[PDB]
Write a protein that binds this ligand. Structure first.
Ligand code: SQC
Lengths: 234, 117, 81, 43, 50, 34, 81, 81, 81, 81, 81, 81, 81, 81
């Protein structure tokens, strides 16, 4: 049978419970991202032919700057560029790492590395950080008094009740879209684990979707973050 | 009934009454019977036109970059240059349809469509 | 008593996902229809249409995946059990 | 060309692209009319 | 083990797919981009020299 | 499953650390290169 | 007694959320179709089309949210339970 | 007896709200599609267009809100209880 | 007996009213799409498109309201018992 | 026995009416969309377009009204009692 | 037992007619949209447009009427009774 | 036991043919809308368009009739039972 | 016990084939609408349009046939007995 | 108890796949409509239109397969059993 939750390495500290497996997966993806960043630093050059990681970073930064400038120029929001990029890779590397052959049989199926996005804590951390950050940006640009006023007013004043709710919806959905996309997958690949090995082709088909959908979800998450910044920064 | 005025910048080509007029606009094929809604459209660079009227045969026109206007009584077809079926030369059109120049190739293909295929 | 509630929760979650999948599939198909039509009309649109497109998908998927979240509550954490 | 307002239709595929394709044609037609007028005047 | 073998075969299949159909195009793009960077460097070079 | 716990902070800090490394040693160097 | 009421409430909430998701996904996809088509026709429209768009999206998702609220009133709270 | 009637009322209200939300979302998306397309094609008509838009939405939402009115009556008044 | 009949009547009335809501909302949205687009293409047609519009809406609303009546006949009155 | 058949008949008649209403509303909206678009394009086409329109509606509403009669058969004089 | 079988047959026939009515109404509306649009565009082509129309209708209505036939089998014959 | 299985089979077959009817009617209506729009555009093309139109109608009717055969399997040769 | 499971499996299979038929019919009709339209505008395009068509149909029909297989599961190899 | 839960899980999975099939089929058909229309308008655009198409498909099919997952969860790994 399938299980939901059942996190491993769970511990308790400071009066709070922590999912050890989720933290370990987040740390693994974070250290991979940091290794990529430091390899760029060690091998970044403008006077010579770029490295592979340099090309990847240039492409991602150019894309994110293109989305930012098309909605909110970096003269107003230069800080959302280092954000939108990391949110991408942090999510992307988080999802694609689940494509490694790290699934085995306990007889219940288990995985050494389970995608952090499959945990509500990871997605909520990312989504609420984005929420707080772009609300702070909106407060800065419109003022602590004017920002709530323009948030409630929105584009149409008399639609105020439909505005506030949407503002509270942005984070939740921004999280739930990421979690549901990956959590669901965590069940599919577990269900595929019930097949015998010679029937268990379905992993190849789903894994490719997981690559595709993880890339799409990283892109959508980052781009919706940029859009939220564009909206909250006038 | 319809009256079709196929007019060229140089001169007019035909203005007699017609029952049905058919041609390839840039949006696709189109046919017109009387009382059609007023319209403005651009013909494809290789557009061919066919007009059907009482008794007489089908009048086929090789049209170069024309424009079709539909009015509450008239249907006018402006053409940079248009040639009737009775005037076209098969060998010359065949040779020109393969020309490298886009305009020349389109004109040749229009002339072939005026004959067939 | 728990069996009845479990069957009801399964049916409810099935309805949740049926609606979510209908909405997601149809909305994503419509958004992709717009994307494909725009790219066919003006090829370079490739560059600029993935921003509004993935926003639309982002809106279409939300209503789906939120439902999916509320499915997990229905199926794995049945509120009224 | 200046726009003059006179006082007190369907389009395929759209009226803006048709306008773009027709303005050069209108300029060609007016140049042609000028050339014919010049030829008659020369004669 | 059976679960591990099955998922490993699936991973191998997807790896082959990406290496034979996804790696080639991406690789090109990387090489074409590098061509560009080197080229621009050298062109600045020649413009300054000239 | 949907109830958060301490991991919400544990992930957040890590993300911030990444948001630091990228915001200092990635984005500024790449912007300079471009 | 309460088992039947809870099962009925779960089924009703599933219906609410399925209908809400269908409406939201399909309406958002339809609105994003117009948004994508407009941006394809005119890239500058990128700027001005989000105001009509996000009005639509919001009105379309109102029905989703109100429904969602009442689903929270169905499974967590339960009239007649 | 009251338990069965309450379960039936909950299911009926869920059907009502699901259908109402489907109609509301899809109709609002369709109306906003016309609004967005018109504003893209004719930018100066924005204010000109919000009148026929909010009218149509006002109709669509009306259909929704009537249904909501009834759903409360189903779950709180529950005729025949 | 009256409990089962009343539960069935509530479910049937919910189906009637939800289907009427879907039809009314989607038809009103579709008609409003034409209204908004025509007004976008023709400022004057504003006056003359209200006649074809309210006729269409009149039909779309009619099927809705009839359902409402029957829904009442299902829930307030009960044809069976 | 009669109570079960009555509840089933009420549910079936509700399904009939919901389907009939969805079809009627959406078809009438789709036909009125063409009517409004044609009358916006050509305003003098009104008298010409009411014949194709009322035919379509005549078909659409026909499918609706048939569902009424059978609904009555389901609801009043329930078969198989 | 027939009570249960008869109730199930009534629900099944109601589903059959609901689906048939949805399909008939929506397809007839869609076909009549094309009929009205064509007769608006080409007033003189009505005769050539009604033959494709009544063909299309003749298809969708068939799907309706076939369903109706089977409804009777469910409602009056009740094969499993 | 059979009465329960028979009622379930009847409801399943009702869903089977309801979905078949919805799909058949709407798909045939859309294909006929395309056919009628094409013939209004180019009234001499009636002969050419019947081949794609009949291919589409054949696909839709193949789906519909395979579903009607599976309803027949459900009702007259109920699996299990 | 087995009777209830079989009835539920039959209802599930009826829902699956019904949704599958809706999806197949509507998607095939939508794709054939584009096929017929394109062949109407471009008579010679047939050759190049049957490849994108049978691709998209190939997807849509796939969604159908998958369901069919699983429905056989539900009804012949019904899990959970 | 397990019989009721199994029947509910089967009905829920049937709803899940019905919705998933509807969404996948209709979205694939809608995307294929754009693909066919664009390849008709621009025959040389086919190669460029597959990327927007297969992305769109890749979305809707995903929504399908996710449903296929949670059906297998309901049917083969029935939660709450
Ligand atoms: O994602 C994003 C999403 N909605 C997805 C969703 C969440 C919950 C339920 C259903 N759908 C939105 C969104 C953002 C703003 C907005 N408006 C602002 C202007 O004034 C009207 C409201 C409307 C929508 C996403 O960005």
């Amino acid at each position: 049978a399938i299980h939901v939750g059942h996190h491993t390495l769970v511990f308790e500290l400071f009066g709070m419970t922590f999912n050890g497996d989720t933290i370990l997966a987040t740390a693994v993806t974070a250290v991979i991202v940091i290794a990529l960043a430091f390899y760029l630093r060690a091998k970044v050059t403008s006077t010579g032919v770029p490295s592979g990681v340099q090309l990847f970073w240039e492409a991602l930064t150019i894309q994110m700057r293109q989305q930012i400038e098309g909605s909110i120029g970096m003269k107003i929001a230069p800080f959302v560029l280092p954000l939108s990029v990391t949110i991408f890779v942090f999510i992307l590397i988080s999802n694609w790492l689940a494509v490694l052959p790290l699934q085995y049989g306990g007889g219940a199926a288990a995985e050494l590395y389970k995608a952090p996005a499959s945990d509500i804590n990871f997605v909520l951390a990312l989504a609420l950080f984005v929420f707080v950050c772009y609300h702070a940006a909106g407060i800065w640009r419109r003022g602590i008094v004017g920002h709530p006023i323009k948030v409630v007013k929105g584009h149409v004043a008399f639609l105020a009740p439909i505005n506030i709710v949407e503002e509270l919806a942005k984070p939740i959905s921004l999280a739930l879209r990421l979690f549901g996309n990956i959590f669901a997958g965590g069940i599919l690949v577990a269900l595929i684990a019930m097949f015998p090995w010679y029937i268990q082709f379905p992993n190849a088909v789903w894994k490719t979707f997981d690559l595709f959908v993880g890339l799409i979800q990283a892109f959508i998450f980052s781009l919706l973050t940029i859009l939220y910044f564009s909206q909250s920064m006038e | 009934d319809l009256n079709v005025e196929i007019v060229a910048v140089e001169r007019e080509l035909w203005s007699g009454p017609a029952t049905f007029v058919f041609t390839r606009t840039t949006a696709g094929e189109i046919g017109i019977l009387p009382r059609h809604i007023p319209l403005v459209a651009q013909l494809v660079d290789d557009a061919m036109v066919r007009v059907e009227r009482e008794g007489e045969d089908d009048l086929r026109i090789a049209v170069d970059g024309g424009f079709l206007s539909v009015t509450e009584e008239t249907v006018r077809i402006l053409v940079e240059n248009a040639q009737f079926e009775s005037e076209i030369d098969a060998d010359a059109a065949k040779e020109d349809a393969a020309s490298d120049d886009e305009r020349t190739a389109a004109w040749g293909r229009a002339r072939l469509r005026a004959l067939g295929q | 008593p728990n069996a009845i509630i479990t069957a009801g929760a399964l049916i409810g979650g099935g309805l949740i996902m049926g609606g979510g999948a209908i909405g997601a599939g149809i909305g994503d198909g419509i958004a992709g229809n717009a994307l494909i039509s725009g790219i066919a009309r003006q090829p370079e649109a490739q560059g600029r249409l993935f921003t509004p497109f993935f926003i639309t998908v982002g809106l279409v998927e939300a209503a789906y995946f939120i439902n999916l979240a509320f499915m997990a509550l229905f199926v794995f954490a049945t509120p009224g059990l | 060309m200046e726009v003059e307002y006179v006082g007190e239709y369907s389009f395929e595929p759209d009226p803006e692209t048709l306008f773009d394709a027709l303005l050069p044609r209108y300029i060609a037609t007016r140049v042609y009319a000028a050339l014919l007028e010049a030829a008659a005047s020369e004669s | 083990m059976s679960i591990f073998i099955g998922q490993l075969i699936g991973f191998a299949v997807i790896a082959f797919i990406i290496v034979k159909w996804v790696v080639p195009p991406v690789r090109t793009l990387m090489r074409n981009q590098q061509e560009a960077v080197r080229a621009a460097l050298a062109e600045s070079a020649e413009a300054a020299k000239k | 499953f949907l109830i958060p716990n301490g991991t919400f902070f544990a992930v957040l800090i890590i993300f911030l650390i990444v948001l630091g490394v990228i915001s200092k040693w990635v984005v500024p160097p790449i912007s300079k290169v471009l």
